Amino acid sequence: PVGQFIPYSHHVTDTIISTKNAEYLSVWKIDGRSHQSASEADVFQWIRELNNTLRGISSANLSLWTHIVRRRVYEYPDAEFDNVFCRQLDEKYRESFTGYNLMVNDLYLTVVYRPVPDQKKHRQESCIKALEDINRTLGQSFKRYGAELLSVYEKGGHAFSAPLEFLARLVNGEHIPMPICRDRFSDYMAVNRPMFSKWGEVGELRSLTGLRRFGMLEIREYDDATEPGQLNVLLESDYEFVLTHSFSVLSRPAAKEYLQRHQKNLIDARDVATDQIEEIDEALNQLISGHFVMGEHHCTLTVYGETVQQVRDNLAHASAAMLDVAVLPKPVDLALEAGYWAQLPANWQWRPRPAPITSLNFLSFSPFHNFMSGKPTGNPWGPAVTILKTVSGTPLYFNFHASKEEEDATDKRLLGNTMLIGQSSSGKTVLLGFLLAQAQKFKPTIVAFDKDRGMEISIRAMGGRY
Amino acid sequence: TLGQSFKRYGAELLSVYEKGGHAFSAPLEFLARLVNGEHIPMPICRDRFSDYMAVNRPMFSKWGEVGELRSLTGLRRFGMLEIREYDDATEPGQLNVLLESDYEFVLTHSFSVLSRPAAKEYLQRHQKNLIDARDVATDQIEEIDEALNQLISGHFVMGEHHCTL
Amino acid sequence: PVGQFIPYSHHVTDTIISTKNAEYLSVWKIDGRSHQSASEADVFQWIRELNNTLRGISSANLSLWTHIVRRRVYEYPDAEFDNVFCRQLDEKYRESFTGYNLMVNDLYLTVVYRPVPDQKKHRQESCIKALEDINR
């Protein structure tokens, strides 16, 4: 049955979805900062600032779910120019664009609250208020992260809800603009209901776009200190995965119980003391100060595609990079039948091995999105051009209108002015002509203020005057 | 003692690579190459390693004419030879013919040195097997006695061995 | 390579081989006299001569196993000449001699004497002398 293991029902606000068991949540789309264009001190500053942000964020049964999902973008349209040589440039570019493994990653952060007729109403209103201030604080905190709260796809026809749609890509793996219905929407999500084997080898997906098959990979035995950007190797990885970190914040009594458990596992181990309980009480004092806040965590990787063998190979590459980053993967048995549901933000019951972790060692995995522009589609216009050859990287999907520092956040449709910095005609001419050719998808009213034969041949070859 | 003996021999005791990055144990990677057939660097962990070598678990045919292994570069096939039939007058440079072999092979020699009463009982049993059957006049039964001489004199010790390519 | 109870050993000497059944053996390569160049009267003379050789051949548990084997020429190390005209001409000629069932036939003879802790030694030593005179 569908709606089993799926809790959601979009019945509270724009931004906050409910679950079928009294839990309330929202999602953030995150264009996280480029890990490549920074010093390591910048990385440590960012993780420290995030621990300051979550330091203010309490333990009131709160939980975060980060989702790192990479996808082949089929949504890039074909170019049409009504012009022959521009079409030749596009097609020569696209045969040059053969290869490049056209899957771009995306970063999502789900904020889930649990409250641990009129009484129900007052409880709901209070947690609405709390999560609203939480989201305001996060948006102020993520100002250099380009994050966007997802609620309000009205007027795209009639009132879509992009958060549910995002959860659809969790459960269906294809981008479906799910609409709003007068139903407890948990039954309405599982469009491609998957199948699981009797043995946990692989799972199957019955999509009308073709049958897919997915394999799962639990992650355990963590390096107790971490490199700050440790899991960044998978952003080049070629499998179209979804990677999920769960983190449910524990209480300070539960934290002290877990540090007592750490003592019972460490100095009440096999009569050995290897100086491991030295900073446990220091971390206790720091989480009393508010720093080392710990919570339950599991992480899971899920990779799908055709051809069960290729699923096995992508699991092999994934485990290889896991052993490269000194963390032990575990291929999943029949529990992946549960484990798929473990990807969901409100599915604590199906988490395989919730292990406690500090906030810093949690944040030392996630937030480092490699650069890729947020318009492969969905702009005020088409996407302009897929700039290829990010060095050891992905296609870029270049465009113009990107969000800025939001003083008078509307200001336009979206501001998109650009500036070139560099010597005269040192490739400047050919890229400017490339951008004019790609802009000729959209038939702009082009005014060109050139100095000295500034692509007069090309501009007149497109039918311009010059 | 080995480092003393291999001073003219370019050797290296492994397992010093730990805390490299975050503590890979060097020889396990070698053992990963022994099992998964790839340079899979194995970090240390808080668990018993026996369950963690098999990154690319090999498989075998139903007949045993070839094996298979979904390597990191894909599914490959393994052929294997076991050893019989020695040239007993051993040569110093016998297997140097495999140096130009264009096939990246694996050569496994084994040795488990048997103690002098064990080898003495073995040589007595082998001489007993030599004198058992008819048409056994090879005049090499006394080379078992020469083997007993060199064994109890301690110069050269037998041990159980198998070799496999 | 499971033995079918195949009687075999190398327990005698250089030129005589053994069995487990105490049977001792010798092999001869025969690149024999070409019958496609000779008269048939010569053939009758040769058969009469080898019949007289059989008259010199005893009945003391002797057995004779002749084998005639037709194998291909795969063991020929065919190679280049390091001479341009020769490497052209002879290799075009080896292509011009396109096989035509190129299979060498050879002929071999097996002499097995059978001698009907020192009893076996004296049996096989008498067999050594017997097979030596036979091979002579």
Automatic annotation (TrEMBL), chain C:
Superkingdom, taxonomy of origin: Bacteria
Spans traversing the lipid bilayer: none
Record-stated family: Belongs to the TrbE/VirB4 family.
Name of the protein in its database record: Type IV secretion system protein virB4
Protein's organism: Salmonella dublin
Gene: trwK
